């Protein structure tokens, strides 16, 4: 499967994703990294790895739909099968999300549905949970969960220490989820729920 990664900044998890696709039995290849912001660290990561990049500036389009259509055109030109969001900070339009239904992944630094939105680590700490984690899910208008990994909150943790621990888990589950979807092992059913598929090819 041909994969695109959309970013807005540092491209958190991008290197983890790249590394996984270099592995022997990978079902995925990262073929393009697209940013809505020029000269961000994630682009440099991609470029240093020899992966094509594109910058699509939202300020050059009339509205959200026009902007997302420009992204989609690039995805079409590169024959992309699957999209991963790595710190993408714009809201994708309904039409874009619908087209990419069951083919676009995102990650969140909590065990959804807990701690939705920004600052999930601070939320976990303020709430006083002893268990948090990360969730990779398909993107919807939210979206069906593919994988989750629980991560302990330790006594004395700061936002930084908890964030680093959750990031190590993300480095593991984002590529694992990508491989599941790229291989066809995990697919979105016609009923809108996750389907674990037994593949014909052995």
UniProtKB/Swiss-Prot annotation:
- Stretches that traverse the bilayer: none
Residue ranges of the region described as GART domain: 3-200
Organism source for this protein?
Homo sapiens (Human)
Say which family it is in. Answer: In the N-terminal section; belongs to the GARS family.
Give a short account of what the protein does: Trifunctional enzyme that catalyzes three distinct reactions as part of the 'de novo' inosine monophosphate biosynthetic pathway.
How does the record comment on the protein's domains? The N-terminal ATP-grasp domain carries the phosphoribosylamine--glycine ligase activity.
- For the ligand ((6R)-10-formyltetrahydrofolate), the binding residues are 64, 89-92, 106
Record-listed N(1)-(5-phospho-beta-D-ribosyl)glycinamide binding positions: 11-13, 167-170
Q: What is this protein called?
A: Trifunctional purine biosynthetic protein adenosine-3
How this chain assembles, per its entry, is: Homodimer.
Q: Which residues form the active site?
A: 108 (proton donor)
Gene behind the chain: GART
